Amino acid sequence: EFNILLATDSYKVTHYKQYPPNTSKVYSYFECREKYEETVFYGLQYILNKYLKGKVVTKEKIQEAKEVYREHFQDDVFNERGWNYILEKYDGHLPIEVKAVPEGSVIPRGNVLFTVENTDPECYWLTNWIETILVQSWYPITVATNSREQKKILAKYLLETSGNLDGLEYKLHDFGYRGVSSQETAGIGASAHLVNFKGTDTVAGIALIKKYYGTKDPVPGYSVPAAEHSTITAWGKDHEKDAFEHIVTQFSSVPVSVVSDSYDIYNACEKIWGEDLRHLIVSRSTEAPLIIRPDSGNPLDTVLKVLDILGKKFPVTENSKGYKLLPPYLRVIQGDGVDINTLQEIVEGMKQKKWSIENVSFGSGGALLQKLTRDLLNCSFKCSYVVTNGLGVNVFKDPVADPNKRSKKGRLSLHRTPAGNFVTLEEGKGDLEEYGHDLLHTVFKNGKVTKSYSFDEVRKNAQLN
Amino acid sequence: FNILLATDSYKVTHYKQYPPNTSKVYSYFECREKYEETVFYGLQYILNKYLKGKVVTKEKIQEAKEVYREHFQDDVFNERGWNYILEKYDGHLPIEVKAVPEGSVIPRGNVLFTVENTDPECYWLTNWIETILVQSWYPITVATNSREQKKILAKYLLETSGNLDGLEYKLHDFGYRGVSSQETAGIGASAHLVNFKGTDTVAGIALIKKYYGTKDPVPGYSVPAAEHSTITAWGKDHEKDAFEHIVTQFSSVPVSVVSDSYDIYNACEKIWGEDLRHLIVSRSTEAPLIIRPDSGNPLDTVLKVLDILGKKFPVTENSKGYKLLPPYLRVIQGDGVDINTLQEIVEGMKQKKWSIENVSFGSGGALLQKLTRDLLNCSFKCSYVVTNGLGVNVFKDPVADPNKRSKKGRLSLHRTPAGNFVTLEEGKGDLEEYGHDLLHTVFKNGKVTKSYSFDEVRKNAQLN
Numbered sequence: 001e002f003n004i005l006l007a008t009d010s011y012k013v014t015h016y017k018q019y020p021p022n023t024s025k026v027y028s029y030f031e032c033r034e035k036y037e038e039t040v041f042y043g044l045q046y047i048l049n050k051y052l053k054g055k056v057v058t059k060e061k062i063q064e065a066k067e068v069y070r071e072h073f074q075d076d077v078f079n080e081r082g083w084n085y086i087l088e089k090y091d092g093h094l095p096i097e098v099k100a101v102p103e104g105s106v107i108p109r110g111n112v113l114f115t116v117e118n119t120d121p122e123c124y125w126l127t128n129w130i131e132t133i134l135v136q137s138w139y140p141i142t143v144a145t146n147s148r149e150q151k152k153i154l155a156k157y158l159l160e161t162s163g164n165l166d167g168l169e170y171k172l173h174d175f176g177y178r179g180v181s182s183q184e185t186a187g188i189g190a191s192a193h194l195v196n197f198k199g200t201d202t203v204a205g206i207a208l209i210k211k212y213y214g215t216k217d218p219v220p221g222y223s224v225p226a227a228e229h230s231t232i233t234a235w236g237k238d239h240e241k242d243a244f245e246h247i248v249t250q251f252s253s254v255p256v257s258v259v260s261d262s263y264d265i266y267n268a269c270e271k272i273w274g275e276d277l278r279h280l281i282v283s284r285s286t287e288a289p290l291i292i293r294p295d296s297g298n299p300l301d302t303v304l305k306v307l308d309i310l311g312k313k314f315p316v317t318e319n320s321k322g323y324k325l326l327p328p329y330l331r332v333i334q335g336d337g338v339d340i341n342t343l344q345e346i347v348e349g350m351k352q353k354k355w356s357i358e359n360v361s362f363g364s365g366g367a368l369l370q371k372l373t374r375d376l377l378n379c380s381f382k383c384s385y386v387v388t389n390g391l392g393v394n395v396f397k398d399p400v401a402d403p404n405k406r407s408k409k410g411r412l413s414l415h416r417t418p419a420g421n422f423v424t425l426e427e428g429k430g431d432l433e434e435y436g437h438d439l440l441h442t443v444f445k446n447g448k449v450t451k452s453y454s455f456d457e458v459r460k461n462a463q464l465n
Numbered sequence: 466f467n468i469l470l471a472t473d474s475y476k477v478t479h480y481k482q483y484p485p486n487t488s489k490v491y492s493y494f495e496c497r498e499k500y501e502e503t504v505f506y507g508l509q510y511i512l513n514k515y516l517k518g519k520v521v522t523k524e525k526i527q528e529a530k531e532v533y534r535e536h537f538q539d540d541v542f543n544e545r546g547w548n549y550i551l552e553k554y555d556g557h558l559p560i561e562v563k564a565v566p567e568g569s570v571i572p573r574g575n576v577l578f579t580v581e582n583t584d585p586e587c588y589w590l591t592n593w594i595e596t597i598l599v600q601s602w603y604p605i606t607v608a609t610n611s612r613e614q615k616k617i618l619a620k621y622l623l624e625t626s627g628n629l630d631g632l633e634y635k636l637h638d639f640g641y642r643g644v645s646s647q648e649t650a651g652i653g654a655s656a657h658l659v660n661f662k663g664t665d666t667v668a669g670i671a672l673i674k675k676y677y678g679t680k681d682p683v684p685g686y687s688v689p690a691a692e693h694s695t696i697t698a699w700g701k702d703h704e705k706d707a708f709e710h711i712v713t714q715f716s717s718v719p720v721s722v723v724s725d726s727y728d729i730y731n732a733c734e735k736i737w738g739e740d741l742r743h744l745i746v747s748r749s750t751e752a753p754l755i756i757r758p759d760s761g762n763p764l765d766t767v768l769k770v771l772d773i774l775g776k777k778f779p780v781t782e783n784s785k786g787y788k789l790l791p792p793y794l795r796v797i798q799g800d801g802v803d804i805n806t807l808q809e810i811v812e813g814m815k816q817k818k819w820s821i822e823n824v825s826f827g828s829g830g831a832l833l834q835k836l837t838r839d840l841l842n843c844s845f846k847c848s849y850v851v852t853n854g855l856g857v858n859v860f861k862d863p864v865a866d867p868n869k870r871s872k873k874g875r876l877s878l879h880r881t882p883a884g885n886f887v888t889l890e891e892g893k894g895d896l897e898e899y900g901h902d903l904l905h906t907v908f909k910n911g912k913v914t915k916s917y918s919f920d921e922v923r924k925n926a927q928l929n
């Protein structure tokens with residue numbers, strides 16, 4: 001089982017002896033320090049429920065921690081007393097209060113997103129002990145944010161080239177399951193992407209959403225049948241056509257994606273799909289199109305040549321915006337080399353060549369769920385206020401060599417400005433009541449989740465515009 | 466955990482795409498052709514935690530059936546196939562996995578492990594588990610990147626001190642908060658511990674002892690250390706009090722004290738260097754003060770810090786001619802360190818004549834998070850199938866990218882006469898023109914057939 005006493009950075013075990021004597025309170029906060037100008041706050045609710053709520057302290061876990069740390073530090077520095085107190089006083093429930101903005105909220109950089117403080121003067125050391133666990137929320141936040149920023153690009157070009165945003169939620173598919181660092185990461189990352197889109201091949205995200213957020217529909221994400229290199233190459237190089245025919249025939253009534261670059265993407269599109277099996281394609285339903293899938297070469301150049309080829313072998317129409325459109329039974333999915341940067345290049349390149357963004361959907365894996373760091377949005381957790389000797393003290397850091405690492409001072413609160421923007425008031429100035437109500441809500445207190453959100457609410461909060 | 470729900474969605478639809486009359490699907494994993502050799506580590510963890518024993522149950526099958534029915538809006542799930550495995554093998558997977566020993570250091574472009582079904586009815590199972598097995602790229606990459614950094618550290622420590630004492634402690638893992646999840650933290654931390662012994666991510670410890678085991682009393686260690694909150698809590702005008710309180714609380718053990726809260730240079734020169742100097746020069750070699758800068762240009766900061774300390778404390782020159790701080794005073798750079806800057810820092814220290822003995826490093830996100838599967842081009846591909854009872858050598862070869870070509874047929878790994886490695890394709894390993902295949906069966910029909918202790922892994926991964 002998971003032991004919260006063992007889920008922190010090793011040195012935090014020695015911190016209770018480092019605070020000023022008679023410190024009864026430690027107050028800390030998380031922010032995405034000051035392009036990603038606005039961030040999607042999502043993921044905390046998962047961590048609270050899975051790791052922090054309920055009886056997380058037991059006699060066993062304490063003993064286990066005692067032994068582990070004794071060897072790790074080659075000494076007994078573990079705060080056994082402190083934990084026994086929580087076990088005995090609160091029945092293993094954590095005496096801390098957490099306030100946060102609603103899950104899914106879109107908040108500009110440099111603002112307080114959530115705060116942590118102890119509710120018992122005895123557990124002044126508990127606030128920062130759980131920094132490590134709570135800080136990992138940077139990941140679902142960063143994934144959701146990066147995913148949302150790509151949706152903006154897609155939304156912009158789709159609107160421009162088609163006149164509407166139909167199907168936008170299916171324009172960027174999650175292909176990152178094998179590309180992430182672990183199973184737990186796959187679930188968290190995939191759920192973050194689902195906040196903005198509906199297409200995913202990382203099934204793990206579904207279960208996480210159901211269990212920790214919940215949705216009205218029986219499922220938050222969908223997928224379609226699709227081939228991979230093994231199912232095509234297995235037929236032997238001279239039988240790629242046989243493979244294609246067999247696959248589109250097995251999935252004749254549902255959308256089907258078929259990777260076509262095993263040997264020569266251009267020959268596959270022009271001769272096999274465009275000639276040898278054209279009759280099996282033009283006969284398909286608009287609800288069950290063939291989705292050709294290139295998977296190599298320069299992303300933009302490949303997509304353009306593919307479209308040029310298909311346009312020469314299939315009927316092409318021009319929509320009301322003046323952009324070329326493949327027939328309804330035929331589409332393309334670019335699932336290689338796609339990241340927020342190249343995505344922009346591809347749709348822009350398509351527009352210049354007069355191809356509607358309607359013709360192509362995208363897939364992204366590692367770049368979507370793995371090539372992300374806590375530094376992209378500068379997620380940071382810092383102590384800004386303590387009470388020692390019964391007196392409040394506003395604390396902060398301000399490294400001389402880096403003004404960007406400066407932190408906020410005192411008790412904080414988030415407010416809406418008259419012009420509809422946001423501001424984080426420091427030093428308790430929020431009490432002045434000049435900016436309406438603080439936007440953070442208590443979501444956790446003394447072992448209980450006091451406020452939560454359904455995934456439908458999160459999605460609503462994260463919408464664009 | 467349900468293995469029937471631990472694969473890329475589309476693989477659920479593959480059993481109907483393979484050529485009819487296919488009785489076998491054989492696939493392999495490689496770190497396709499800096500980073501010329503990789504450390505094979507991690508597969509054993511995945512086999513034990515996710516693939517061994519009864520992994521199929523009536524419940525798990527029904528659960529997947531319903532999930533996929535809604536996910537696909539159609540019942541494409543292969544309930545019959547999974548049910549077959551449940552009744553025939555009591556939920557044990559009919560697959561065989563062969564691999565090089567855990568910890569092996571292998572050149573790029575070589576087969577590292579292979580997978581194949583052992584029951585003709587389960588030809589589709591081989592690639593069903595590709596997703597879960599492919600995630601081994603992570604520990605492989607962490608271990609590899611960490612080992613390359615140890616090489617750099619080794620080169621400069623030896624060059625500037627004459628030996629390699631304490632090498633396994635020169636790079637500390639600070640990545641707990643910087644990774645994407647709890648599970649990732651444990652996996653990555655254990656990968657790092659293959660090369661070093663210092664870590665702040667305790668989860669790595671539990672993973673090691675449970676999945677590999679060690680006859681070791683100290684697989685991973687750590688020392689008392691302050692953070693910004695414990696220093697800044699005292700108030701800006703009391704940083705000195707915080708420092709004095711901390712060093713006295715940990716008077717007899719090594720202690721790391723972050724010193725850049727306000728002005729790292731003032732702390733080194735005035736506080737540690739003057740006001741509290743009496744509390745430092747009195748410490749023992751086994752309980753040094755470890756000053757930790759945490760901001761600014763990593764190389765420039767370290768050099769200015771050493772220059773400052775050199776002026777306030779007695780400096781010696783070792784037998785190699787490099788300057789050395791007193792035994793009770795050291796430095797740890799735990800910000801902005803990665804494989805590239807690490808190299809710039811030690812080279813910069815060497816030019817200014819400072820022994821690498823003076824400084825140790827810490828790395829978080831760059832160590833366990835800023836890494837991807839394409840760093841070593843980790844890939845899983847099918848190279849052989851049996852259809853209509855005839856073997857067929859399989860492979861891909863995209864016209865737009867020769868780097869994506871895969872190997873053909875049955876593979877085997879052998880040592881060459883000159884002591885190198887070669888991957889023999891198309892079953893040629895059978896000719897016996899080389900020695901024994903270096904891959905070993907580590908998994909077969911639900912059972913882990915060969916295991917390695919973390920001590921063997923460390924041995925296999927050693928340097929030089």
Ligand SMILES: NC(=O)c1ccc[n+]([C@@H]2O[C@H](COP(=O)(O)O)[C@@H](O)[C@H]2O)c1
Nearest residue numbers: 175179201226335336364365366473475
């Ligand atoms: N349904 C699908 O076509 C599907 C699902 C998961 C991964 N993939 C492929 O796997 C690879 C993963 O690599 P990346 O992490 O770079 O995306 C890509 O080539 C991707 O297209 C495809």
Ligand SMILES: NC(=O)c1ccc[n+]([C@@H]2O[C@H](COP(=O)(O)O)[C@@H](O)[C@H]2O)c1
Nearest residue numbers: 009011639643665690799800828829830
């Ligand atoms: N014992 C320690 O000093 C210790 C442990 C864990 C993290 N840290 C700090 O946490 C931060 C982690 O951030 P990065 O992911 O960018 O490495 C660093 O500033 C690092 O120094 C320090």
